[PDB]
Amino acid sequence: TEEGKLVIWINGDKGYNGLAEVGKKFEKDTGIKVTVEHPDKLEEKFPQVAGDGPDIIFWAHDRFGGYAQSGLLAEITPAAAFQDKLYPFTWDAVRYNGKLIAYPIAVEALSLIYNKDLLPNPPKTWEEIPALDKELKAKGKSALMFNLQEPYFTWPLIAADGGYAFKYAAGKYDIKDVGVDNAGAKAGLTFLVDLIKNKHMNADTDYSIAEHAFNHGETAMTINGPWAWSNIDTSAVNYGVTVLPTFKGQPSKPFVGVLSAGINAASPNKELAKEFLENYLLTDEGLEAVNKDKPLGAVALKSYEEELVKDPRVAATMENAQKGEIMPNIPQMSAFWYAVRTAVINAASGRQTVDAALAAAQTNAHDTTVFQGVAGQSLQVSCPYDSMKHWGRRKAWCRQLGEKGPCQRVVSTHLSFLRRWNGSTAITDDTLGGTLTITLRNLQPHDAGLYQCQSLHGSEADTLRKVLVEVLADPLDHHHHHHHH
Numbered sequence: 001t002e003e004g005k006l007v008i009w010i011n012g013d014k015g016y017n018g019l020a021e022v023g024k025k026f027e028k029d030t031g032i033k034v035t036v037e038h039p040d041k042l043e044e045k046f047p048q049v050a051g052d053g054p055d056i057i058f059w060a061h062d063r064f065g066g067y068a069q070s071g072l073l074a075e076i077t078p079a080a081a082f083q084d085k086l087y088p089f090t091w092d093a094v095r096y097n098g099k100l101i102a103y104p105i106a107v108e109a110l111s112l113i114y115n116k117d118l119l120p121n122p123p124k125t126w127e128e129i130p131a132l133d134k135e136l137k138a139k140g141k142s143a144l145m146f147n148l149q150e151p152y153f154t155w156p157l158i159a160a161d162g163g164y165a166f167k168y169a170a171g172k173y174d175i176k177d178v179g180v181d182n183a184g185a186k187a188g189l190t191f192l193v194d195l196i197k198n199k200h201m202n203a204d205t206d207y208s209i210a211e212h213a214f215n216h217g218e219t220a221m222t223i224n225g226p227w228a229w230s231n232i233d234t235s236a237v238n239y240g241v242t243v244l245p246t247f248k249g250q251p252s253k254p255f256v257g258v259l260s261a262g263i264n265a266a267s268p269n270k271e272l273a274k275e276f277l278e279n280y281l282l283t284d285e286g287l288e289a290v291n292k293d294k295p296l297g298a299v300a301l302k303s304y305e306e307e308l309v310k311d312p313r314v315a316a317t318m319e320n321a322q323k324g325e326i327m328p329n330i331p332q333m334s335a336f337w338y339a340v341r342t343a344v345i346n347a348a349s350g351r352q353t354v355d356a357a358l359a360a361a362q363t364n365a366h367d368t369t370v371f372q373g374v375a376g377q378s379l380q381v382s383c384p385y386d387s388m389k390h391w392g393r394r395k396a397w398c399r400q401l402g403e404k405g406p407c408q409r410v411v412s413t414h415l416s417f418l419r420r421w422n423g424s425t426a427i428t429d430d431t432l433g434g435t436l437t438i439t440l441r442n443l444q445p446h447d448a449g450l451y452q453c454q455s456l457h458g459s460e461a462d463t464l465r466k467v468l469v470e471v472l473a474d475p476l477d478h479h480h481h482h483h484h485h
């Protein structure tokens, strides 16, 4: 960052050229240069560089609770008159611990996109896709192609019969109640895997492959968001945007994302960012400039949404959004997505069965795992990992210094042993089996807290597991004569 200018990060699938046009208008009126960038993995780079992060970060709201907890985002305090211009639902997406941590921009949900020439009557159920694919294959076409590398696209099907991320009850999420390995989640993922086994879909289909096949008239349907419509408009394919197919008679339940713009807590340009976001971007003209490049979906700005909702594609986006639910913005969402991404990729490739893939995802979707030990005794912490993925990497055990501090290295593999506070920590790695083991001797309350098992590569560290060490009292420490009769 540099004082007197704005650097913005936004994902490569969004209208970054339209956003740059709003930046050009801001520069024309004020002299302030606005640079819009679309780095790869920007959502993973942001917490590592936020140092030299951007002034503004755009992403769906699900990642922002984690950034806010880490102290990376400035609290936003728009006037009541400004808050009244955006929908209360969109403000709900960006409120964390009672404070607003980003400006909401647009509401997104996946829909079924279909080729009206190949399929004038798209299927209402997922169950009828195998027979439809057989008929289309006889004509050199396929029924459906969509991104199988990101769990966001398969989640509507996994959630349809009962899968869920974190149980919700009266404005709160229970982070201990995860629904990744229930009967409904297994049924949805088994249906997806059966589509691949029967050659109705390919496990390696990604965003680019599905978009190219649909936009070239090779597949009758795709599953995508509003941002994808402008490339289809250019392709001249006669497309429709409609309700996703049902599974076991239940609607598919897409996770609803609210594209949001957070202000970096370390930015010396917070006031410029606020003026740009409130008075340039979040205006009917500003949002239209972005929408014209890549559609936003249902915008957070009431005045513009009242017009956009007349677009049948936007009404279809809201119909699918209403069948699903808003993603939580809680810090625990990252772990949930990483676990489900792994389960889908492994089940689709045949590397794991659906049952084993979802059992591992259920365990790993929990951001932290408690390891309880008794004071004065030894505690063995286990960190399973993918031996192939982490082949050749050294490992580390680090202790989290508060909610916002660094994870401070304790021991690593090749100082693998550390004696401190009359106790000790030793790390051992079974590289063939994929199990990292940390042994804490003479466990005491001073050892309680959050730690990470890590896999190192270059100057980066991958989190293998977050562990909460809990220390039960030594039974002898309460030595007394109990009551008798």
Ligand SMILES: OC[C@H]1O[C@H](O[C@H]2[C@H](O)[C@@H](O)[C@@H](O[C@H]3[C@H](O)[C@@H](O)[C@@H](O)O[C@@H]3CO)O[C@@H]2CO)[C@H](O)[C@@H](O)[C@@H]1O
Binding pocket: 011, 013, 043, 044, 059, 060, 061, 062, 063, 108, 150, 151, 152, 153, 225, 257, 334, 337, 338, 341
């Ligand atoms: O898959 C690992 C991946 O998990 C998490 O990513 C999720 C996003 O945080 C979540 O917003 C959603 O992303 C979709 C966007 O909302 C949508 O606008 C569009 O850009 O498509 C995105 C899906 O590709 O879903 C993903 C999970 O698929 C986590 O935050 C990432 O760092 C991680 O790489």
Ligand SMILES: OCCNc1ccc(Br)cc1
Binding pocket: 351, 388
């Ligand atoms: O060639 C198979 C041995 N190679 C290999 C590479 C990646 C994974 Br996942 C599994 C196996």
